[PDB]
Design a protein around this ligand. Structure first.
Ligand SMILES: */C=C\C(=O)N1C[C@@H]2CCOc3c(Cl)c(-c4c(O)cccc4F)c(F)c4ncnc(c34)N2C[C@H]1C
Ligand SMILES: Nc1nc2c(ncn2[C@@H]2O[C@H](COP(=O)(O)OP(=O)(O)O)[C@@H](O)[C@H]2O)c(=O)[nH]1
Ligand SMILES: [Ca+2]
Ligand SMILES: [Mg+2]
Length: 168
């Protein structure tokens, strides 16, 4: 009865993909999550009054082209583009992730949310306005999160569901 959405969490090594996902699903912050574990999780969620089943893939692996990775990513319906607000390289890498999503999905207008994680840290190198201007250019929402404090974590995933509902 309820819609199911396949969501995929992407972004550079160490930005908090696993921490964000494990906060959403299990309600705790993981300090040292094995950077090889790629796994999916399911969660029923009510968003704007309507329940959906989220099937969430937390990506991991090697920095390499993989045809089989393409085939799996093509089945994703929406993507979280995660960077860390204290890591300029992770923010520069966003463009590469968006390009790969569009490549494997035939240049669809893929539902995406830009996520600035580690908002609890005072060591910021990427300003809120720079990430808002990038999100504006791409036509997507921007959310600031902290997997450590839980701030914005539900909003990031909910916003992505809102984006898929608008697209479908
Ligand atoms: C510390 C290891 C780690 O987290 N990463 C990030 C990432 C892990 C997932 O692999 C990547 C993926 Cl899914 C894509 C990708 C493709 O291939 C198609 C569509 C969407 C999409 F996100 C990449 F483009 C990647 N590019 C480089 N490296 C990775 C991926 N990863 C390995 C490593 C940096
Ligand atoms: N201070 C802070 N550290 C974080 C946050 N999110 C993740 N981390 C830490 O950053 C490191 C990398 O996180 P992880 O989720 O493993 O990143 P992944 O490689 O993207 O899966 C870990 O030590 C986390 O505990 C956050 O919001 N704030
Ligand atoms: Ca848009
Ligand atoms: Mg991880």
């Amino acid at each position: 009865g309820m819609t199911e959405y396949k969501l995929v969490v992407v972004g550079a090594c160490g930005v908090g993909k696993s921490a964000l996902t494990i906060q959403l699903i299990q309600n705790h912050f993981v300090d040292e999550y094995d950077p090889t574990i790629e796994d999916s999780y399911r969660k029923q969620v009510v968003i704007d009054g309507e329940t959906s089943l989220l099937d969430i893939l937390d990506t991991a692996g090697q920095e390499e082209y993989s045809a089989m990775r393409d085939q799996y990513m093509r089945t994703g319906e929406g993507f979280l583009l995660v960077f860390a607000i204290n890591n300029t390289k992770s923010f520069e890498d966003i463009h590469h992730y968006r390009e790969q999503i569009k490549r494997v999905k035939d240049s669809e207008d893929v539902p995406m949310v830009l996520v600035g994680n580690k908002s609890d840290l005072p060591s910021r190198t990427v300003d809120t306005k720079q990430a808002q201007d990038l999100a504006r250019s791409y036509g997507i929402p921007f959310i600031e999160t902290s997997a450590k404090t839980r701030q914005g974590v539900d909003d990031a995933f909910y916003t992505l569901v809102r984006e898929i509902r608008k697209h479908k």
